[PDB]
Design a binder for this molecule. Sequence first.
Ligand SMILES: CC(C)(c1cc(I)c(O)c(I)c1)c1cc(I)c(O)c(I)c1
Lengths: 213, 220
Amino acid sequence: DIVLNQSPAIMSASPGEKVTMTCNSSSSVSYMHWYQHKPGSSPRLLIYDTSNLASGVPARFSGSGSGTSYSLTISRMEAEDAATYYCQQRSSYPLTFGAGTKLEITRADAAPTVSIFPPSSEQLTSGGASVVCFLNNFYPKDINVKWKIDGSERQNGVLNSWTDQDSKDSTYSMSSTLTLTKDEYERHNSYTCEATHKTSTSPIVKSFNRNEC
Amino acid sequence: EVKLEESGGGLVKLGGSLKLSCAASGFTFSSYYMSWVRQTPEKRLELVAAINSNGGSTYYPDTVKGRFTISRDNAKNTLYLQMSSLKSEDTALYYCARGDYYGSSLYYYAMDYWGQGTSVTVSSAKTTPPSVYPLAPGSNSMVTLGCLVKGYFPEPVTVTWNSGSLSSGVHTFPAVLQSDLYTLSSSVTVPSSTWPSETVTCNVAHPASSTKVDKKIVPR
Ligand SMILES: CC(C)(c1cc(I)c(O)c(I)c1)c1cc(I)c(O)c(I)c1
């Protein structure tokens, strides 16, 4: 086992921009490989033996590094190159792969579209109640969503989930589901969903009440 | 043109066993080193086993050596990987890639062609059919709807809106695991003129439990 630290874990790049990612090893290695992995497809050999490009690879990809430090370079970034790259050592067995570097596309900031949904009548029959709040199409990825029950905040019972960067607009969509019990749900009135984002200095507030409709 | 196709993945309990497969096509299968590589749920790549030209030498990492068996059938152009005493960390997407050519004058120890992989889950959790819940607003020209697919196991799960005729505005968020149960949600955005004036249906399918549910999004 040879630890291969890939830095950084995640990073963004704009089209035409230069991207450089390293991959240091705990022990000296003779050569280093590089693979490109994109969601929906299988891994792809990108560079073999440090600086040798595989078949049908654009010249913008270049390999370098020796000893305990290997780097993968992209002359000018493009949306076609948004994926996760893994480095592999080929000096000792077993053949180990690095943690991986996730490369995202940099686009213009986009405000999220918030939307809160009360629990359905089907779930309330089973003694459960889940309040969902969608935040669709925004950038960058980092975003904070907060819950409030009758004014008071709730941090336990929430389950967030982001989506991979969309290939069309290159935005991020995030979901948040607050699950509770039927009794605890029928115990309060105001259910609010707050969304604080880079493009939203103040929080975007969406709420509803049980004493309406 | 080359092709690699796996098969055999599924759900097994702690200590169970499975036997995978790899369909070779578009190249002399009896001339390349074949191996298996898995991808942990945390998106980590690990080599599990490798075999040479014939059924001679084999390699197994210490984390797997002693319970996984990698055989091949050059006459049948197939690659196998027996899995026994499966622990929890064995859960992952197992690939089968091609290694170096038998006579390359010098080996590279690289895998240039991979496969789509076959998902394998090792857990003592019981297969639970999911519960589909409609998400409708409670009292903008665009309206957002969605359905909640809570409490199921194991993966995967599929969702479509109006039988796939709604591709734009759809968002299926990755499931979340909490207490041996997955929960997924999906949203769809449509013009306010189309809803609730028309019908928006949510199509959920769970191959594991072999269940399929269609749910409408009624107003209120
Ligand atoms: C896993 C490894 C390093 C290997 C395979 C066998 I079998 C052995 O007996 C030994 I020691 C070592 C290997 C992987 C690939 I992928 C190759 O193309 C080659 I060559 C070798």
